[PDB]
């Protein structure tokens, strides 16, 4: 049973910061690639970002300069560091682990910016 | 569009099925099981691709498809769109839009 674990959302005023984490738990296989994905009430999923084994690091225009992706290669986990925030990000996030197999996504991470 | 000479976006775009089978295709109605009340959008669906599939052919990438003329480089825009959509399995949607 493949789990992904992501925590480190909440409610934060206008300008602020947070780091997100998803830790992966199961079979990941060594070529893995994992990404962040918006969900606001009433849109689709909207990619945030991707990285893959390779260290490369894809964002879309949506946030650009403002999101960061980290890696543990010791752990193999992902960090999602959320900053300069503004309203326009007031969306659930999940998480998606293409690997080779089965993709397993996450239980969702309330982000919160408004004042 | 599970059968053998078969056309549609999943027939050509997801899972070619080869004029020449021999096998079976046996499917169920998870409404019980896939559907949850907001909407289990975990299961995703292409519906552009630059050419369609060859049989048992498997596309995980998840490219940007360039619907204009100007290259989207990994971003969605413009005649930019992601591959992936997500379905709304809900257990209130018609016998077709169940899962």
């Known amino acids: 049973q493949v789990q992904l674990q992501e925590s480190g959302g909440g409610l934060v005023q206008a300008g602020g910061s947070l780091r997100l984490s998803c830790a992966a738990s199961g079979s990941i296989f060594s070529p893995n690639t994992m990404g962040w994905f918006r969900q606001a009430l009433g849109k689709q999923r909207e990619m945030v970002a991707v990285?893959?084994?390779?260290?490369?690091?894809q964002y879309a225009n949506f946030v650009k300069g403002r999101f960061t992706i980290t890696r543990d290669n010791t752990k193999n986990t992902v960090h999602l560091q959320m900053n300069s925030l503004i309203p326009e990000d007031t969306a659930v996030y999940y998480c998606?682990?293409?690997?080779?197999?089965?993709?397993?996504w996450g239980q969702g991470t309330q982000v919160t910016v408004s004042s | 569009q599970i059968a053998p000479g078969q056309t549609g976006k999943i027939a050509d775009y997801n899972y070619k099925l080869p004029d020449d089978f021999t096998g079976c295709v046996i499917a169920w109605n998870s409404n019980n099981l896939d559907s949850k009340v907001g909407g289990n959008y975990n299961y995703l669906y292409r519906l552009f691709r630059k050419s369609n599939l060859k049989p048992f052919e498997r596309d995980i990438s998840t490219e940007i498809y360039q619907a204009g003329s100007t290259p989207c480089n990994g971003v969605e825009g413009f005649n930019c769109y992601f591959p992936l959509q997500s379905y709304g399995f809900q257990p209130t949607n018609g016998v077709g839009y169940q899962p």
């Open positions: 990285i893959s084994s390779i260290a490369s690091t």
């Open positions: 998606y682990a293409v690997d080779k197999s089965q993709d397993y």
